[PDB]
Design a binder for these strands. Sequence first.
RNA 1: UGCUUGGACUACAUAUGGUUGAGGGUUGUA
RNA 2: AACUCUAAGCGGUGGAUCACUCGGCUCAUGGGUCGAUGAAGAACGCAGCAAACUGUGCGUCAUCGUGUGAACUGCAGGACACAUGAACAUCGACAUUUUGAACGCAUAUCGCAGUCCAUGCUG
RNA 3: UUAUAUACAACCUCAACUCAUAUGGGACUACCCCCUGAAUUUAAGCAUAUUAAUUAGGGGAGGAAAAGAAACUAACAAGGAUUUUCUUAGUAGCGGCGAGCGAAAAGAAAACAGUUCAGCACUAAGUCACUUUGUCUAUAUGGCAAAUGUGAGAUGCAGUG
RNA 4: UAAACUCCAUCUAAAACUAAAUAUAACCAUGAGACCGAUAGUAAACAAGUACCGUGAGGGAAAGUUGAAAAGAACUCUGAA
RNA 5: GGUACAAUGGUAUGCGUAGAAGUGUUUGGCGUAAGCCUGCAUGGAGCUGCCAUUGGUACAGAUCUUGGUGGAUAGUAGCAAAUAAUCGAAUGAGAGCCUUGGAGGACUGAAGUGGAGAAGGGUUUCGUGUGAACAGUGGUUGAUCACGAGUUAGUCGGUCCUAAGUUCAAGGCGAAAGCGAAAAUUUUCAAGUAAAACAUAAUUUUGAACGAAAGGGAAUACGGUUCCAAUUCCGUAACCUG
Lengths: 131, 196, 50, 87, 135, 61
Amino acid sequence: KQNPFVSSSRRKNRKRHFQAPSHIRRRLMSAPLSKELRQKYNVRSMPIRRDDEVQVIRGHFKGNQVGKVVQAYRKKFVVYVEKIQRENANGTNVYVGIHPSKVLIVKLKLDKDRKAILERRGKGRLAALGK
Amino acid sequence: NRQAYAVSELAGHQTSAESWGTGRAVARIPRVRGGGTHRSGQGAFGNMCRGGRMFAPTKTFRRWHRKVNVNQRRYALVSAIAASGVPALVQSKGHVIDGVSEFPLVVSDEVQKVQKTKQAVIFLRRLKIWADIQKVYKSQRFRAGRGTMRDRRRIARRGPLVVYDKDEGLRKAFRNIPGIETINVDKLNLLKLAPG
Amino acid sequence: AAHKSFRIKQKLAKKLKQNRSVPQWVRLRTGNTIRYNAKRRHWRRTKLKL
Amino acid sequence: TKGTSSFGKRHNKTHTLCRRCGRSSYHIQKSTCAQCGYPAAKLRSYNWSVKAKRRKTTGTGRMQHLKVVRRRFRNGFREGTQAKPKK
Amino acid sequence: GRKRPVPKGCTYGKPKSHGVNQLKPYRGLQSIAEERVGRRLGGLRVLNSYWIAQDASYKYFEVILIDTHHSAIRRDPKINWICKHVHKHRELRGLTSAGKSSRGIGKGYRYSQTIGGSRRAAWKRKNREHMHRKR
Amino acid sequence: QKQKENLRKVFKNKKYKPLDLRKKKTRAIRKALSPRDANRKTLKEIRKRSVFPQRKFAVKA
RNA sequence: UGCUUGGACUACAUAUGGUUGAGGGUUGUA
RNA sequence: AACUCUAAGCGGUGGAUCACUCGGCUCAUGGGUCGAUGAAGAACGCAGCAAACUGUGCGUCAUCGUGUGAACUGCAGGACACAUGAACAUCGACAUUUUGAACGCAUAUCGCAGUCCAUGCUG
RNA sequence: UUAUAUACAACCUCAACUCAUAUGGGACUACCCCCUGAAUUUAAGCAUAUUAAUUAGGGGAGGAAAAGAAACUAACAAGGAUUUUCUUAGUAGCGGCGAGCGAAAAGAAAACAGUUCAGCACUAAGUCACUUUGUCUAUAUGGCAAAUGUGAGAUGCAGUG
RNA sequence: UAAACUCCAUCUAAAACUAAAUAUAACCAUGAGACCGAUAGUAAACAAGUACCGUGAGGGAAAGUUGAAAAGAACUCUGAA
RNA sequence: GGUACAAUGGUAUGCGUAGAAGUGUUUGGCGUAAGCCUGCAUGGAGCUGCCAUUGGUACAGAUCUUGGUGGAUAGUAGCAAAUAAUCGAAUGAGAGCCUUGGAGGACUGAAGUGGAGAAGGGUUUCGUGUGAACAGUGGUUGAUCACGAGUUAGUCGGUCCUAAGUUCAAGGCGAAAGCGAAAAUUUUCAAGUAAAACAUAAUUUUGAACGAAAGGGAAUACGGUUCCAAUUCCGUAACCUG
């Protein structure tokens, strides 16, 4: 917008994210926190993980029921949640893929690193609201 | 503000293709040479061929820019300030102004210190200028090109122009409102003062 | 020829292993486009020129 | 008998493989490649054919050394150090 | 002079092209002299060359040449300019005193058209066709 | 690299270390007058250097 | 000593030294 | 309900038209870096299942150290190897086969040496 | 020494080495320097001319290169290295005086930076490279000193200029 | 404007270095556009300098699009399929 | 002057998943005309009117270019050289083939259609499996397609030697490349020593290398063995080199 090393080209923005590698594709794989975890942590969004719990917002499954994810299938830009599912012709349960923008994290899986993102994404909100 | 375009200077001409002449029962154009590849012997070099050079290729030394007399760009700036009074002519560029106080709208130098976009829209609300911004949002479209693939998909049409003298904060504060742009007195672009 | 060199026998060996099909899982990868093998030669229709 | 009958006598090779370029264009009696001009210290290329130069330029193959040197330029050709850990 | 190396099936062209046996080089015998030393000795730079004798078929020259990676050419700051990389094969580029004269480099008027440098730098300039933006 | 780091400990203090324990930068950079005498100077230029420094001045009335 | 196996080396042209030298090429104490 | 003519409807054959675009092209900006320390290029090898492309060199679709911090996925198999770090980038460590300016001599040959150091079999 | 019969020396011209140390070839192609050099074309024919001091061929470098601090202009009230742009100017000139071709000084800009040798009554070789030994602190074709060890150097090295 | 006289001006050739403004279809990294939109734009949007042809120098293609998600049509009948 | 196409700048408080572009059409029209508006049907995400300025701006032709298609024609085009097959059986979804085995009539007639090699080819060989395509008819078979396998040497060859010749070596030459040289260049340019004495001492320069799977050139034969290899494995008996 005001940076001359920033492209507003359709072409270069579609290309730089479909060809994103699978660790830029974690930050592209992001989902909003719940309004209680947004209020507990002062963190708005998060990169999704495996043992995170999750509610579906848009699309046919549309949600009030929280299930945990089982694949952050970064290659398709899609997640698979534990009971969001579908049938084959021959009665096999297949997981239906949801993009993380259309989903809502209600319980984050925490270890020593997923906690330290919260003490980094929340500390940099009070330090960006006090401007 | 235009940029140069041209086809490649070697395109259509990357073939060693000569003409079978007559009498080989096929027309006399340069046909590609060898064998076994769908491409021989097929038709090369021509505007009417498939893969040839275009009829006269576009060159990068077209005159794209222009010299206008300076006294003729002063004449046009002047005729775009005398039409930014006259509310028959602002009312015929669209431009909701049936609640605007005076023509010319002169406001204080206190508008030149507006520092947030929240403050800036109240000024446009209080001075009944906001009804032209609301017509800016109702004109936000997509282009019907071809321009959509060439980085001009779109945003709106034009709104008010805030000629200012000093900039204490108002070009930042008016930066994000659609349709609005702020300009210094001494410069005065004609491209911004009579758009189109 | 039945008297070849070591270097013609290794270039003949590499074109021999390269004359497999595409494995059929490869058409099961995501967004795959490879359908057949496009670099299959027969020994009788296209020659190697070696 | 310039044609069909004459072409059955083709069973000897004018060009075997070439030991620089790997094309089967090394003339055996000349002992001279027709493509890279092999036993001659310097490659054969010409400005009257840009398509041929195109086909064997730098970066038609692997560039096994050059694009490590491109990645090393941007770091100032540093050597003998490693990234100390944090953070 | 320079016999023109056309094959005795001599020069095909228009009759201005037919000269074989009375043409001269553009570089002198001293120019071509230290040229023949700079090739055969690629590990050394040619500084300057000098006539020492001649008779009827051979002029011959001494050539001052310099071992540029020696630890006394490089450590000594007067001569030390030619240990640089714009001085690799200067004698093959017209840059020694003998190769320099063939080029036609001087001031002012008589030496006019090599006025940007080379001679070909000057045809490039004098034929340069500036289309302007504002034109 | 437990054995090349050991050879680099032995070919400390010796001039003429092996060509592999020796700084492959580029071929052009390794030859081109190591800057410890690319910018050494004649005694005539060190004596023009120490008598008239560029003075530091300002002009207007 | 003995056959195998592994490694180092063995191109050319050049510069500066080193080392061995050639020459009734100029000379010298005898 | 021969065949023919014409029209539309349905089916075919064909792949225009329109709408797409990790591709071209053109203009400009910043920067200056190959190789006898073996380049560019070539060849052949290398994956649990792989032919090509991409990557690589017997340490062979990778690689020390860093960064990030849970995947990779077509299918298995393992991840107890975050929680002392997957996958990715990055890359400063180590490494880089036969070649190739190509350097023991050759090479339509995996042909023939020498000198030397070691080991593995007599004594 | 040399009846080419004992040595001895020293130079000078040249050798040899799998000697110590080093240096060089090859690649790329857009720009750059040095060379070699056409014909189509146009002239309504065509040979000079033109195309062109160009395509192609050959060689050599750098991030730019080349050029460059006057054997330059002018004829002034004088200017002052190089290179690039504007103008001079399609001008002066050149040309089967046909086709065609064709610069420069001054002026206006951009940028600005200046110097070094050889050769004299420099007036104690006042210099340099190795190698070894002390000894600095890159993984140094470095730093200093010692032996001034061996050589370059009086067929001329440094400083001044 | 060639020559001879007598001037005048003007430089100091036959040795050497030198940044900057300048150039840049290549390379490393970028940004753009009144450009093209798959018979177009690179020859090449795709495993493209590929397949393939030529002894060789060299010549050199065609080929983008299910759907939002494979949910990629279980099962039955008929058939050698 | 007017109309089609694509854009850019303005503009229409334009239109659009409640269906845009496109296409289809006996929906109804308007325009002298280029063309336009409209309904319905398909379609699934973009597009149009106006003012200006534009441009790779309008096709029936070019033995135009690329692609697709029609007749001719399901064919009086044709699939007729190399004598020739027939019976019965089994398999099979289906048999004139190549599928097999049996019987039988024939041909090649050994200067072969037999058995082996050299070029060249490169897995085609072989076993099992086989579905489309290919085998210009068929196909249960295949030199096709899938899968699995297969090539063993001191004695056969290469490799060694030279031929005709070739590549290089600094006399040379050339702006160079390089001679579409053949260098024959070249101070001791090459050898020699159970290695020496009043030079250690006797001697030689055409350098060098490549170039023959038919020339030259050490040494092996038998019997057996496999789905597939054999002067190579196995057994047996020899031989050459060091």
